[PDB]
Structure 1
Amino acid sequence: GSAPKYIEHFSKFSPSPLSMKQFLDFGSNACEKTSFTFLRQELPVRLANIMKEINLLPDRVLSTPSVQLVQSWYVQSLLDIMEFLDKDPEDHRTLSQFTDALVTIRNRHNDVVPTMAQGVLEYKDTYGDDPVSNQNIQYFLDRFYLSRISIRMLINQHTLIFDPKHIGSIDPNCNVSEVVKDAYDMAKLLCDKYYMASPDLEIQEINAANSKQPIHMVYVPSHLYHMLFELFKNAMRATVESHESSLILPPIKVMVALGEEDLSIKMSDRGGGVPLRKIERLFSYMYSTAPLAGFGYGLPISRLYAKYFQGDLQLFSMEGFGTDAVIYLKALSTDSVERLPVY
C-alpha cells in the first residue's frame, strides 16, 4: 500500500487554519464545489500531520492495541479521501459520494475517546504514572484532540450545509445566556435525578460598551454547550455534596461579560473548592483516568474546545469556599481563527 508515502507527502504541507469569516463564506450556499476542492486537499494534510505524530510515539505505546486501532482508522480515512483527488468537481455524482464518504469517516472515528483512554490506562499499569509520562501524555493528547476537533469541524460544516440563520454548526447570532440556561436546565435535570436537590442559577450580563443589549456572538453553540454542561455538572456536584448536612444550598452564579476583545463566562460556586496544589490534575488525562460522573466531555476536552477558536478555559478556587471556572472566548469574529497543533 501507499499510506507511508501519502502520510509523508501530505505532512510536508501545513494545515491552513480558517476564521469565522472564512467559515461563514463557505456556507452561504452553492459553493459546494469549492468546499470539495478545499477539503480533498486539506483533510489529507490534517490527517497526515497527526498521523505522522502518532507514528513517532515510542514503540511501547505505539504497539498497544488501542493505538494500533486508531492508527488503522486514520489510514483508512485518508485512503477514503485520496480517491477523490483526480475526480471531477463538475460531476454532481462526485459531490454526493464525497459527502457519503465524510459521514462514513465521522462514524468510523466516533469512539476514539474511550479507545485512547484504554491506552492511557494500559500505559499506567504497564509503565507507571510518573510526572514525565504525564507531560508526554498531556502534550500528545491535547494535540491529537485539538486536531480531531478541527477535522470534525471541517466535516460537519460540509455535511450539514450540502445535504437563513444557522450556518451548519455556526450560529452567527448566538445568545450566550440562552446557551447557559439550556446547559444549566440539562445539568439540573440530571442533578435532581441523582441527588434530589439542585442549586439555582443566577445569570448577570455585563455589556461594557452597550450597557443594556443582550450579549450575542458568532460561535459554535454545540461547543459552548459542551463546555457549559461540564462546568455545571462539576459545580452542582461540588455544591450539593458539600451541603448535605445543611439547609441553605447556594446558587451557581454565572456572569457573562463582553469586553472589546474577550467575551468571558464565569461560573462561580460555593462547593468548598480544591486546594491550589490539586488543580492541575483536573486537566490531566492520565490522573483523571481509572478503570453524574458519566456525563460530559470532561475538563481537558472542554478546554480544547475553548482553545480551538483562540480562547481558553481556566479554573481558580478558594479552598473552603468554592471555585470559579471561566471560559474565555474571542468577542470579534475576526479574532476567531482555528488554533491547530503546530507540526
Structure 2
Amino acid sequence: GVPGQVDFYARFSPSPLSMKQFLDFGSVNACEKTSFMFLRQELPVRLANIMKEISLLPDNLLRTPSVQLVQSWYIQSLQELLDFKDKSAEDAKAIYDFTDTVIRIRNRHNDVIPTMAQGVIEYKESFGVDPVTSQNVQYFLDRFYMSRISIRMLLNQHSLLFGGHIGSINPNCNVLEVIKDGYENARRLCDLYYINSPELELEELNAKSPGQPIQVVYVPSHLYHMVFELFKNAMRATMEHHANRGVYPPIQVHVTLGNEDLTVKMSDRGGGVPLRKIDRLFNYMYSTAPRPRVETSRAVPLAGFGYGLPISRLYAQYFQGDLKLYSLEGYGTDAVIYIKALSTDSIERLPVYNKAAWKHYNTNHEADDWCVP
C-alpha cells in the first residue's frame, strides 16, 4: 500500500541540481513537459527518502499530533504525485493537471517547518529529552529540514515557471540590499522590545571587481532569512549586555566577494559565549521554545522570530555554503555566512536514505579512541 510506495521510491537517491542548472533549465525555452518528466520521479523520490526516516523517530516524538500531521501531508502528496507516473508526457491534460498538483502541494506544505517545530515542542513538553534518542532527533531534524528546503525549491521553481527572476532565483541578487532589508526588519522588532537598537556599520569589498556592486546568483529569501537571524541574535546580545550603560555599540557587517566565496561577517559587542556552550545553539532540542502567546499586547521577544540558527545554517549549507560562529567570551561574537560566488559550485546538498542513514539511528557515536576526560 503506502508502505510499498514509500519503499519503492526510497530505493532511489535524490538527484542534486546546481543553481546554474536551475537557472538554465528555466530561462530560454523553459519546458513544462521536461520539468514534468523530471519532477514526477524526483518529487516522489525526495518525499519517500525522508518519509523513511520519519518512521525511525522515537515513538513519543513520532506520535505527537504535529508530526502526525506533517507525515499525513507527505503521504497525501506522495500519492497524488504517483497518480501521474503512467501518464504520457505528450498528454497536455496530464501536464496541466500535474502543474496544478504541484501548486496544490506547494500550498499544503507551506507550514511544514513550523509544524514540525511544534511537534518538537510537544515532544519535549510531554516526555522531556530522552538522552538515548536525542542524538537521533538532532540527526533527523537536520535532514528533514534540509529535505524540506530542497522540496520547497523544486515546488517553487515549477510553480513560478509554469503557473500561468528565474522562478525564485535572482541571477543578480543585490547582496547589500538584502542585508539592509534584514537589518531594518530586525531593528524594527528590536526597537519594539528594547526601546532602542544598535546602529548598522556596513563595509563592502568587491575583490573580484573593485568598486563594482556585489551581486551573485542566489535565492534572495534564503539570504534574507540567514541575515535576519544573525541580526536578531546580535541585537538581543547587544541590548541585553549593555542595558545598564544605556549606550549601545553598533553591529558591524563586512561583505566580501572573493574569487570563490561571498562572505558576510557580522560582529557584535554583546559579551560573547564560551566555546563550550556555542554548539548547543545549533541543537534543536536546546533551541526550540514554545512560541509567544497570541493574546498579549506586549512586544514579542526577538527569540520568537525567524527560522532559528540551525535552519539558517542549513540554508547556507544547502548550496554548499556555511554559517559559522566564533565568540570571544567577555567581548562579543562574530557570525559568518559563506556562499559560493559561482552558480556552478552551488550544488544542492541532499540527504539520502540507505543503510548508512539507518545505521545512524541504531548506532552510538562515541569517540572511544581518545580518553574521556
SS, match of residue 293 in structure 1: helix
Residues of 2 paired with 1:18 and 1:30: CA distance? 16
Instruction: Give the 5 Å matches for 1:237-316.
Output: 237-291=236-290, 292-316=302-326
Q: Does the 8 A contact of 2:229 with 2:312 survive in 1? A: yes
CA displacement 1:108-143 (0-9 Å, x = unmatched): 223333332343234335554255433221100000
Match of 2:178 in 1: 179
Residues of 1 paired with 2:106 and 2:30: CA distance? 23
Q: Does the 8 A contact of 1:272 with 1:322 survive in 2? A: yes
Residues of 2 paired with 1:18 and 1:45: CA distance? 14
Verify: 1:206 aligned to 2:216, yes or no.
no
Q: Does the 8 A contact of 1:134 with 1:284 survive in 2? A: no
Residues of 1 paired with 2:109 and 2:177: CA distance? 31
Shift of 1:182: 1.1
SS, match of residue 286 in structure 1: helix
Match of 1:80 in 2: 80
Residues of 1 paired with 2:133 and 2:11: CA distance? 29
Residues of 1 paired with 2:48 and 2:119: CA distance? 21
The residue type paired with residue 13 of structure 2 is: S
CA displacement 1:7-29 (0-9 Å, x = unmatched): 11111111100001210122114
Residues of 1 paired with 2:156 and 2:96: CA distance? 15
Verify: 1:219 aligned to 2:229, yes or no.
no
The residue type paired with residue 97 of structure 2 is: Q
Aligned in 2, Cα 1:118/1:9: closer, same or farther, shift over 3 Å? same
Residues of 2 paired with 1:110 and 1:241: CA distance? 34
Instruction: Give the 5 Å matches for 1:11-160.
Output: 11-28=10-27, 29-129=29-129, 131-160=131-160
Give unpaired runs (5+ residues) of structure 2. Answer: 291-301, 354-373
CA-atom RMSD in angstroms: 1.7
Residues of 2 paired with 1:171 and 1:124: CA distance? 39
Give unpaired runs (5+ residues) of structure 1. Answer: none
SS, match of residue 329 in structure 1: strand
Match of 2:2 in 1: 3
SS, match of residue 172 in structure 2: strand
Residues of 2 paired with 1:222 and 1:109: CA distance? 17
Residues of 1 paired with 2:3 and 2:130: CA distance? 33
Match of 2:333 in 1: 323
Q: Does the 8 A contact of 2:261 with 2:339 survive in 1? A: yes
Residues of 1 paired with 2:277 and 2:59: CA distance? 32
SS, match of residue 284 in structure 2: coil
Aligned in 2, Cα 1:58/1:131: closer, same or farther, shift over 3 Å? closer
Residues of 1 paired with 2:132 and 2:255: CA distance? 37
Shift of 1:302: 0.4
The residue type paired with residue 78 of structure 1 is: L
The residue type paired with residue 42 of structure 1 is: E
More divergent stretch after superposition (239-248 vs 281-290)? 239-248
The residue type paired with residue 95 of structure 1 is: I
SS, match of residue 123 in structure 1: helix
Q: Does the 8 A contact of 2:201 with 2:252 survive in 1? A: yes
Aligned length, in residue pairs: 340
Verify: 1:341 aligned to 2:340, yes or no.
no
The residue type paired with residue 74 of structure 2 is: Y
SS, match of residue 180 in structure 1: helix
CA displacement 1:70-98 (0-9 Å, x = unmatched): 22111101011011122233333323322
TM-score between the two structures when normalised by the length of structure 1: 0.94
TM-score between the two structures when normalised by the length of structure 2: 0.86
More divergent stretch after superposition (303-312 vs 83-92)? 83-92
More divergent stretch after superposition (273-282 vs 142-151)? 273-282
Shift of 1:340: 0.2
The residue type paired with residue 87 of structure 2 is: K
